[PDB]
Amino acid sequence: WRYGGDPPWPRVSPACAGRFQSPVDIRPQLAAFSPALRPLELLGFQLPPLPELRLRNNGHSVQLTLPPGLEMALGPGREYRALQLHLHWGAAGRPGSEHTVEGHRFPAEIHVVHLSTAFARVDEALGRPGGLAVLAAFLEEGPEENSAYEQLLSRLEEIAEEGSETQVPGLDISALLPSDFSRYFQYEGSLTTPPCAQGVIWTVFNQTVMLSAKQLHTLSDTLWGPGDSRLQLNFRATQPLNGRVIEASFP
């Protein structure tokens, strides 16, 4: 599969034609205030430098593989372990977030993909209710170099070629996300690439993460994908809610 053309994703995986897909357009006025949505809790995200982590250009994103021991809870008894994180972005003067807010597309987006502690492996969790959970935050331009992001972005030149990888020192993985874990939207949807399995709990933070202009340009201008193509605009079009109601943790 690829962004932009064939093969049609439903031929790759029938689940890509499900009724309840991601990403979606978030309309805050239509979101349901749900006070059971408590602040997200992360444990073990502050990593030592060794052992190193693998950072890979997989042709459709840059993905950092996360080690064992990163625990995340959506609430009491809703426990998960982090597997990996990756990014979605646009191109010179064009935004490339997956989720939108009232039609607004943000420059870029981070996804941190987690596996329910009830499952030993991802393949067993695919399509099961709440088997996977993704934390999603928008990346916007701020005035300062983001030092946590710089640790990844400074290494993209080493992995410019499709299918290449490098090792990076461990870092505070929570520093790639907003400091506000209280205010967010949450809904049930799908993986945004094949196999597009449903039952995924998506949490999209209110607060955004700030990268420099230079950093955003590095993200979108360094990596190459399938063929001789720049790896850019690597986002799926928004999918209709089709009757799902997005919940918000704040009125």
Residue 243 identity:
G
204 binds ligand Y0R per the rule CB under 6 A: no
Do residues 25 and 102 lie in contact, with contact meaning Cβ atoms separated by under 8 Å?
yes
Q: For residue 53, which phi and psi values (nearest 5 degrees)?
A: -110, 155
Cα four-point dihedral sign 208, 209, 210, 212: negative
114 is in an annotated binding site: no
Binding status of residue 111 toward Zn ion by CB under 5 A: yes
CB of 125 to ligand Y0R, least distance (A): 9
Residue 119 amino acid letter = F
Q: Is 104 annotated as a binding residue?
A: no
- Which residue stretch of 7-15, 70-78, 189-197, 205-213 sits at the interface with ligand Y0R (rule: CB under 6 A)? 189-197
Rg, C-alpha atoms of the chain: 17
CA–CA distances in Å: residue 130 to residues 50, 81, 113, 244, 245: 32, 13, 12, 15, 16
The binder of 175, among ligand Y0R, Zn ion, none, by C-beta within 5 to 8 A per type, is none
Q: Does 102 bind ligand Y0R (CB under 6 A)?
A: no
- Is 217 catalytic? The answer is no
Residue from 93, 133, 131, 119 nearest 213 by CA = 93
Figure out which of the listed residues 26, 42, 113, 219 binds ligand Y0R, where binding follows CB under 6 A: 113
111 is in an annotated binding site: yes
Residue 136 contacts residue 202 (beta carbons within 8 Å) = yes
* Interface mask toward ligand Y0R for 147-186; x: CB under 6 A: ----------------------------------------
- Point out which residues bind ligand Y0R (CB under 6 A): 111, 113, 122-123, 134, 191-193
**Which sequence positions are flagged as catalytic?**
60
- Point out which residues bind Zn ion (CB under 5 A): 111
